[PDB]
Symmetry: C3
């Protein structure tokens, strides 16, 4: 079975798409968000290492800790506040930068599904699962802020309502 | 988790469509951009259909792709060679959509083996990979850049 | 003619997604700075197409006229060495990204690893040309090496784990 290897592979894949997304973001307009995304990459590197550990050991604790989840939650609340109230369902995209963040959103969910599957097979750091779960919410929230700061509409499913 | 994987992968495709749209000049590609926005609504509908244990995705959305595929095959150079993905950045982004549609399709096939699906969703994903291939070639054509040939 | 889930059909499409991400990566690279790497990436696309054909032969009971041959693996190894030599000494772990071009090649790296995992799972269904697995294995190393050279030539730092 290869669920563990696929899980840390998929967190690595996510990390690579985060790298691409950063490059879409102007340094001045998104200095906050760019800093967060670099932080997230560091954290995804730690999550991958944690996933690769078959059993956590005395001399080798998990690196991914609760604080990283708490931070995402703080930023999500901030970005929901910043963006216009959501009136309709959102289709991914708008600005190239927002689009790249929606890709990160969906790939986070893919990584999550694999960690859920791993958890069913054996021991994981539960922080990694919680982190990936919140990341999709984070990427959704910042994508909307990115469109907002760039003065472009989110793409909406027409005539829908939340 | 096949069902959840299938609708997550339709959502992933939808996100890649969102990125491809941003590669396309609004004037040069008004037709194809409008179609891609339409497809994103349809993929959202397909995801909802997949998550159901009436279906929203209907035959007409497949017939639309088929009509456009024909229109674009007519516009594009006569293909008699294997084509590798890429050329313009915009065409490349649409070839990515093609391959990710095929990934979504594989999961929906697997889901169909396990339980009832809306057959329209499978057929639509299948046709989408042909659509993305044909539009990618039109995009390179309109930009006056070559497709990438295998030989 | 064949079932929708015929293993040979699935096997045939294994490397297509990676091929498309290579396509995107090429478009990020200026011919005047990257003629070498661009030429090799087109070569790799032709090779990935050949790998698909070979994978589709996994149930063939006769001798297989494989198209993927040792030489292409040797080629990647030599170019990797060249690019390691060019790039600055690697002393920290690298986070994927930096330039948009390098970021797109890090995406190829992770997608190649995904394709490699797919190919290992196909070994349960038939006999896989060993060159294809070796090739995909080395490709992730090739993409890592070129991503670093791409940042170097663009005079931008790699993104480091710190």
């Amino acid at each position: 079975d290869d669920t563990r290897v696929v899980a840390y592979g998929t967190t690595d894949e996510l990390n690579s798409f985060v790298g691409s997304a950063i490059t879409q973001l102007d340094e001045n307009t998104f200095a906050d968000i760019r800093g967060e995304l670099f932080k997230i990459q560091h954290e995804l590197f730690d999550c991958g290492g944690d996933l690769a550990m078959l059993k956590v050991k005395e001399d080798r604790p998990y690196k991914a800790k609760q604080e990283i989840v708490d931070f995402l939650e703080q930023r999500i609340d901030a970005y929901i506040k910043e963006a216009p109230e959501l009136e309709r369902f959102i289709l991914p995209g708008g600005s190239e930068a927002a689009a790249s963040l929606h890709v990160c959103r969906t790939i986070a969910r893919r990584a999550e599904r694999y960690v859920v599957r791993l958890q069913q097979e054996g021991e994981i750091n539960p922080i990694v699962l919680k982190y990936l779960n919140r990341l999709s919410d984070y990427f959704f929230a910042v994508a909307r802020v990115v469109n907002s700061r760039l003065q472009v509409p989110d793409v909406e499913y027409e005539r829908s309502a939340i």
